[PDB]
């Protein structure tokens, strides 16, 4: 929506002023403003806007005031502050050139979302549930990143670690919690929905959608119409399934050419992915997962709305 | 105190179990146990123990139960978790070889820049400890908010320190007493001195902002001497070794040197400060001797002690003077 996107983006200048003491240390406060301005507001803001959409579809229609929708927008920006911190750090860790300037900037940007929460939410019933959610998601996200790191040793991928169980765990902890669960749980808490069973049923569907989302992203990295997962030796769905299907000779090709800088080695891996019928395997998985997720959304109870979860599902599958 | 130290150290293994004992990912929880065991419990736990001591001197004697003193201990370990996360990061940022004898965590087999994740993880973990033990107590939200605020303030301090360096060379024009004082306050004094006392006050259900304000004033003054003394001893302490000069740090010695230096002496600092060659460290140390920095420190130690003691005598409301005198004595060693 034009109205939702514009109202959301209009909050950002306020967040910057809130976090930059708008003081005895103006030069470092001015620097932090530039850290936020470079790293937080550019690009799509899907997690932030999903927080507003979630609240709008969970809250009673009578309670949807401009004031409440703005609070949902502020929670959205706290998710985008978390996103920014993860993006700053991961790029240092993976020594990435581009995405789409100091080390402690990721700790600072992460820490800043709790100042925003304190400013706007400290007098509301949802305050402690929301801070505890952010605390738990950062802890779990770190466990995800560390599990991902345990698939690499001395710059070489550990292909024995490339199991579907470990992959599913990496996606859940590293990505799905903060990307899919966090926005919806935030929307629920702001709508004064605290029922554990409601959060649990939401979590189940969102982790399923999250897993397909990342598998699709992994697939498109190699087979989309420019991906470097193979070169970076990433624990990708393609690599995990390739090893499941591989005969000893196909396993040797992975062991020799996966996670190499030479463009020829990337091309060799893609050729093996084609030989192993990974495109067909993805098509089957996309159909099966869509039908299972559609079923689980139809089955959603505990007084949760289906349209929210269908909207999230549609955005990912694009049908 | 043997009993205090032993009681405090006995809590750590429970905290490791609280944070690592997520049954579907055993390898990462086992790794995190090791991250905590390497980085958190070894050497002096001065900040952690100071939290217990603060509480014991703030709380009503009748309320000092084994249970409450343990809660004070757990808050102290939350300070040590924050400490461990900061030192993990700072070592990567400064590319230091050792800290407290131990090789820096980032230098360990297959860590490097993954120390950023470990930094974030250890900092995050203290909030899990707070939830387990404090979620039901009135002090819960004030303590959570204090930890988040101190984290934010510490990051401002580290960034200000970083703005005294460019391309691995110190910016001597940035080495002013006003910027130095700000670095020490934000980077060190908040988490080292303010956080332990404020935690003790909150656990003793002391929420009066004016009490916290009066405490902060005194603790920032004691904190400033503590870092100046540490900076002095880096160059002039008996090793039986300080690398502040080699590292080109914004040290009290470097700041006061630049105040007292004639153009010729200013050129020695510009030429030799922050260089790796041992001869350059010798030249700076010799310039500090020439400029009479030892005498200058001796006068400051005497004058700051007297000024702070006066300020403690004038502390208002129901704050115990004895707590601030004990902190003073521990730092000045008199
Ligand atoms: C540091 C942490 C906790 C990250 C969690 C979320 C995240 C953005 C991971 C990086 O993805 P990736 O490195 O697998 O891929 P890419 O960098 O290509 O997005
Ligand atoms: C936000 C962060 C990461 C803050 C770091 C704070 C800190 C205690 C650093 C050490 O200071 P230093 O580097 O001047 O001294 P040393 O490393 O010698 O103790
Ligand atoms: Mg990564
Ligand atoms: Mg990456
Ligand atoms: Mg990438
Ligand atoms: Mg990808
Ligand atoms: Mg250092
Ligand atoms: Mg440093
Ligand atoms: Mg020192
Ligand atoms: Mg050092």
Numbering used by the authors:
A (entry chain B): 87 to 108, 112 to 189, 203 to 327, 334 to 427
B (entry chain A): 87 to 107, 111 to 329, 334 to 427
What did the published study say regarding this structure?
Here we characterize a metal-dependent, bifunctional isoprenyl diphosphate synthase from the leaf beetle Phaedon cochleariae by structural and functional analyses. Isoprenyl diphosphate synthase in P. cochleariae (PcIDS1, EC 2.5.1.1) produces FPP in the presence of Mg2+, but preferably forms GPP when exposed to the heavy metal ions (HMIs) Co2+ or Mn2+. Inter- and intramolecular cooperative effects in the homodimer strongly depend on the provided metal ions and regulate the biosynthetic flux of terpene precursors to either biological defence or physiological development. Strikingly, a unique chain length determination domain adapts to form geranyl or farnesyl pyrophosphate by altering enzyme symmetry and ligand affinity between both subunits.
Stabilized by cation–π interactions with R427, the F315 side chain positions IPPHAl for nucleophilic attack. V286 and I420 form the bottom of this specificity pocket and act as a molecular ruler, whereas F282 and F315 engage in π-stacking with both allyl groups.
